[PDB]
Design a protein around this ligand. Structure first.
Ligand code: RBJ
Lengths: 300, 237
């Protein structure tokens, strides 16, 4: 169990840690989050009470260092920082726990939600999508654009998702225009899995990270990436059976966790209707089709 | 974007463009089998690829052999159309390649887009116009070369005959669309109007009769009357 201490909370803010959130008042004696499960990536996220346009946060893994939050009154945001002095850090954490100024990561023992959403997400791959090599943790916010979005302006602050484009040279073999456009198996299996991702775990890890960035930050380009990676599997006639079974589990937990009020902006009607009802895989996502039909029958 | 009534004059500027109509690519007769089931028999088809400025028509004949042993032929027909338009473009010298291709049916956008992926500078456009190019197979000489074909063939025509010697492209396109609209609405009546006066013949190298300027005005009037009559009957107006 690990700890992310806070220097202070000078501004009223809704703090998120993974799928949980709590409201902190201006200058409320709040010194952080304890009992954070080791073995998973985590995301701490922020929405200012004054400016709900400040939706932003930090992907981190407690195994990679000692991380804390401190408010920057100049840049006007809660910043993540690494403490390299292990002894100063243990010291600070012990004192705030003793004074019980920390909230407990509020996990139910039976509850595998966060594991299920982050199964294939690894901090090393996050740091390749979000490039800032001096830090061990990755900043994401609502406004950040994707490399693909930027092709159609600041490259330092972009999300480096794998470019997927169904009407591209990469996607289509010359002489196989109709075959490759109607059956994307070539693009999925040779170009993306064997060529770029190397395996289905890396592919799923990017799909899950894209989803979580869409859900927690309302990051529009992440939503596009999540739908594109789903559509590329659903539009492929030839997909390994283990990948179909795992995709069904992945999507089930994403749809289960999505806030009901956000389904209208976060879910693309066309992709879902095509994946569940029209595509090669219309009969391969049993768990996903049942939760979608029971939770979002309107969208379909 | 979409080609419509508003942006009509763009057809007649000096940017090379082609209309592609795929209506007559996949053509069938529907008949009863011995057992009383229904079957199709394909007949020869064509791609209607037209430069509306010059009148140059690239008629790609689609021989029934293309369909042998293929499934989902109405879908294949769209891809076969895109493949052949793609091959036509690559056969043309650079300075003759189109800057836009306008498809008469939106279902041709994705097939042509994918076939022309490596021509990023050629715009593939739909249209809001309901152009009567389906009626091309009502032009006797075009119907004749399609139905006689024993193999895949490209035949080159000028669908304006020699009209550009006397009228603008705008006027030539308006006459072409009026003739084809008439042929589509009432083929028998349209044909009677064009071929009645036996002293006005079709030159060996032409598709349409050798009307004088005054005779075209009479013909055009008779075609417009025919179209509005049939509109009356159709809608009981
Ligand atoms: C040759 N037809 C268009 C095309 C499609 C894919 C490709 O890699 C190059 C060109």
């Amino acid at each position: 169990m690990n700890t992310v201490p806070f220097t202070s909370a000078p501004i009223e803010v809704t703090i998120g840690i993974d799928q949980y959130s709590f409201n902190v008042k201006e200058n409320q004696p709040f010194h952080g989050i304890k009992d954070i499960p080791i073995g998973h990536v985590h995301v701490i996220h922020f929405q200012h009470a004054d400016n709900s346009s400040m939706r932003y946060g930090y992907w981190f893994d407690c195994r990679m260092g000692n991380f804390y939050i401190q408010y920057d009154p100049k840049d006007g945001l809660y910043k993540m920082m690494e403490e390299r002095d292990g002894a100063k850090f243990e010291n600070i954490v012990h004192n705030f726990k003793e004074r019980q100024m920390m909230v407990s990561y509020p996990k139910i023992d039976e509850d595998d939600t966060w594991y299920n959403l982050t199964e294939f997400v690894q901090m090393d791959k996050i740091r390749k999508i979000v490039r800032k090599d001096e830090n061990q943790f990755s900043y994401v916010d609502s406004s950040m654009t994707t490399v693909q979005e930027n092709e159609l302006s600041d490259p330092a602050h972009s999300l480096n998702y794998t470019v997927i484009n169904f009407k591209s040279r990469e996607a289509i073999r010359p002489g196989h225009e109709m075959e490759d456009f109607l059956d994307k198996s070539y693009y999925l299996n040779t170009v993306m899995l064997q060529g770029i991702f190397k395996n289905s775990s890396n592919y799923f890890g990017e799909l899950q990270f894209a989803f979580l960035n869409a859900m927690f930050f309302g990051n529009y380009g992440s939503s596009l990436q999540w739908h594109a990676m789903i559509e590329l599997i659903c539009s492929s006639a030839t997909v390994p059976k283990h990948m179909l079974d795992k995709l069904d589990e992945i999507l089930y937990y994403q749809i289960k966790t999505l806030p009901e009020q956000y389904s209208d902006i976060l879910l693309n009607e066309r992709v879902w209707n095509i994946c569940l009802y029209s595509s090669f895989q219309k009969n391969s996502l049993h768990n996903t089709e049942k939760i979608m039909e029971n939770k979002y029958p309107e969208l379909l | 974007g979409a080609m419509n009534s508003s942006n009509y004059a763009e057809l007649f500027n000096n940017d090379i463009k082609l209309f592609v109509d795929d209506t007559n690519v996949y053509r069938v007769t529907v008949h009863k089998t011995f057992e009383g089931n229904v079957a199709t028999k394909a007949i020869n088809g064509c791609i209607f690829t037209l430069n509306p400025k010059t009148g140059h028509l690239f008629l790609k004949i689609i021989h029934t052999s293309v369909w042998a042993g293929q499934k989902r032929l109405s879908q294949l027909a769209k891809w076969k159309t895109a493949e052949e338009v793609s091959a036509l473009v690559r056969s043309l010298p650079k300075e003759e390649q189109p800057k836009q291709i306008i498809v008469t049916r939106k279902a041709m956008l994705d097939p042509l887009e994918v076939h022309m992926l490596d021509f990023p500078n050629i715009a593939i456009r739909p249209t809001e116009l309901r152009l009567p190019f389906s009626a091309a197979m009502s032009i006797d000489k075009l119907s004749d070369v399609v139905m006689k074909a024993t193999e895949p063939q490209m035949v080159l025509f000028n669908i304006y005959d020699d009209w550009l010697d006397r009228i603008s492209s705008y006027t030539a396109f308006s006459r072409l669309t009026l003739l084809l609209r008439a042929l589509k609405t009432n083929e028998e009546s349209a044909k009677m109007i064009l071929l009645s006066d036996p002293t006005i013949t079709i030159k060996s190298y032409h598709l349409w009769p050798s009307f004088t300027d005054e005779q075209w005005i009479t013909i055009e009037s008779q075609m417009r009357d025919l179209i509005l009559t049939e509109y009356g009957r159709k809608y009981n107006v």
